[PDB]
Design a protein around this ligand. Structure first.
Ligand SMILES: Cc1nc(CNC(=O)c2[nH]c([C@H]3CCCNC3)nc2C)c[nH]1
Lengths: 39, 155
């Protein structure tokens, strides 16, 4: 049986770790909710 | 506990307490990804949260009421993933989203890799508004993981 626990407030934090790239991808979404790449 | 904020979704079905995902509590409605709970009921102390709406294609589910989150990525600015990893404290990560181009339109995407149990963590704009949830994405030719910015529809 599942249960929930509070993990924090939802706020924007100034001076957070800035990381991660911005890739433009050609994708497809199937009936099961699965994303896949189209090439 | 119905206080607004970010929550861990846990299970005692496996060895110890295992974190299967994360969710957002807003306006008395709990929002998470469908693959975290599979539509199952949730416990919050003595209280029970029953599912209200869900969709396997969108990979979203809401508890106690209809989907409340309606803010969207502006397609220009950086965003923050408030990542809640298993066994670790909540952490904000700022990134500029990429794009998923589909036959039905473009969707924002965040190129951050985190454990499976981080699914449902909220993505926020500079005002702290939840513009979507992390956890439904794809694995690119790099081997890395890129998640869509998944947002529901508020009626
Ligand atoms: C590598 C990595 N994945 C994440 C987040 N996503 C998952 O873990 C995940 N996604 C799905 C399917 C099921 C429903 C349709 N969407 C995809 N199953 C799982 C377990 C973080 N890091």
């Amino acid at each position: 049986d599942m249960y929930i626990e509070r993990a924090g407030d939802i706020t924007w934090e100034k001076d957070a770790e800035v990381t991660g790239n911005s890739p433009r991808l050609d994708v497809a979404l199937d009936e099961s909710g699965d994303f896949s790449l189209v090439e | 506990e119905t206080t607004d904020g970010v929550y861990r979704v846990m299970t005692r079905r496996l060895l110890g307490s295992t974190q299967v995902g994360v969710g957002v509590m807003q306006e008395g409605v709990f929002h998470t990804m469908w693959h975290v709970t599979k539509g199952a009921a949730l416990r919050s102390g003595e209280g029970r949260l029953d599912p209200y709406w869900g969709d396997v294609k969108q990979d979203l589910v809401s508890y106690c009421g209809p989907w409340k989150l309606d803010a969207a990525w502006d397609g220009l600015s950086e965003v923050q993933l408030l990542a809640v990893p298993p066994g670790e404290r909540a952490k904000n990560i700022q990134t500029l989203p990429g794009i998923f181009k589909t036959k039905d339109g473009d969707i924002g995407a965040v190129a951050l890799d985190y454990p499976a149990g981080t699914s449902g963590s909220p993505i926020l704009d500079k005002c702290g508004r939840v513009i979507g949830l992390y956890g439904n994405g794809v694995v690119i030719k790099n081997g890395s993981y890129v998640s869509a910015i998944t947002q529901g529809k508020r009626e």
